[PDB]
């Protein structure tokens, strides 16, 4: 017969091998396939779905009051409402989202994102905001005057009720420590809120996030969310 010899590494057991196996029950026909709607083939079809974030980054905000920031008529004309550190791995507004739970299983991520805000006041109420994006080089601005000189849009929520902000490029890893300052999306008040004498004086915002079609993930590990 054919003359053989054994290699080193003969009879071991890797957990990550791809070989055939002995069937338990030959001549057994399983139930045939049926068209069940909504098949997913790739886990980047899940991170490209919009999912709201926790804008209200104050302490002792318990419950579903974390998903909204209140602006009122008795507020000042130049103060910031929020800022989002664009760190997926760290604690903050982007931890418990849909893009920040799938990318805990993988080590490296790189791609562009897409944020969306939505104003939930009455039909009569007007005013303007300003949405500043800071690149990973510079730091977060503290006044509205020093924030205007970056990249900004002046959003009038008396006509529109939704805006769209495109984040150009983020990336990150785990580096066995941790990176920081990948960007900030801060929002200042431009004019004060104007409500009539019949609507309420308190309005609210809601923020969304979803990855674009060039997001990417690599080197799967195990998540620390449940361990």
């Amino acid at each position: 017969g054919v003359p053989t010899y054994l290699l080193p590494g003969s009879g071991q057991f890797l957990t990550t091998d791809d070989h055939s196996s002995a069937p338990a029950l030959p001549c057994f026909n399983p139930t045939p396939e049926m068209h069940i709607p909504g098949q997913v083939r790739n886990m980047l079809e899940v991170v490209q779905v919009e999912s709201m974030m926790e804008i209200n980054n104050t302490e002792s905000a318990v419950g579903m009051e974390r998903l909204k920031v209140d602006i009122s008529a008795l507020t000042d004309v130049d103060q910031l409402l929020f800022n989002i550190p664009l760190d997926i791995q760290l604690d903050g507004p982007l931890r418990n989202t849909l893009v920040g739970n799938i990318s805990r299983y993988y080590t490296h991520w790189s791609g562009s994102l897409e944020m969306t805000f939505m104003f939930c006041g009455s039909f009569m109420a007007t005013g303007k905001l300003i949405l500043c994006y800071t690149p990973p080089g510079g730091s977060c601005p503290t006044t509205r005057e020093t924030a205007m000189l970056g990249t900004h849009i002046v959003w009038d929520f008396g006509l529109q009720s939704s805006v769209t902000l495109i984040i150009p490029w983020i990336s990150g890893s785990h580096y066995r420590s941790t990176n920081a300052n990948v960007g900030y999306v801060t929002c200042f008040m431009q004019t004060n809120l104007i409500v009539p004498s019949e609507s309420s004086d308190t309005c609210s915002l809601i923020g969304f996030i979803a990855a674009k079609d060039d997001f990417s993930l690599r080197l799967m590990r195990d998540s620390p969310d449940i361990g």
Partner: antibody
Amino acid sequence: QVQLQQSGTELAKPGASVKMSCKASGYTFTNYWMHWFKQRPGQGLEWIGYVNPNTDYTDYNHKFKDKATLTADKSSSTAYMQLSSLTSEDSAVYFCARGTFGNYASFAYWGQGTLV
Amino acid sequence: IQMIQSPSSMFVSLSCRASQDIRGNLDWYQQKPGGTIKLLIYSTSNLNSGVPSRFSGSGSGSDYSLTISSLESEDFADYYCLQRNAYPLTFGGGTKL
């Protein structure tokens, strides 16, 4: 940092007049109304009036209509309040507060007081 | 308009009534014995930017109330209430706490 710096204390004989000041610094003057208060010691506060530094238009409480006058100064950023015909009942501490950008009369920033 | 302060001293659900209805529109101020005043609650339910969370306010048509859960050492200061419905502005009495 917003500061409201008032003058020191003084007193006067009954029948005379006296003038105070509440110099404001740290924000944009001529946008916010400047209110004025009175606290007789051992009692609560009381509203006197205000002055609009943008249009120089005032409005007084009905009780203090004939006692106090209210002016404003854009160059030195100072709000004055001059009393008239002092008696023994006009001895209290006197406060100054800042309103809101939307003229809603909320009083986040205050002064320290001027004893008469 | 006249407002009353229903307790005069307390040694923590202090409340205040009013002559009319004021449609919210009520603030809560606190005066330290040094001579410094800062507000705590505005428009009868919100909180100021820079106050600890223990303080809370309740609302109604005309009978409003402040509520503290747990006390504190330098919490001991008298509390005032202000209506801003119509001029002139009227304060309360104050509870020496």
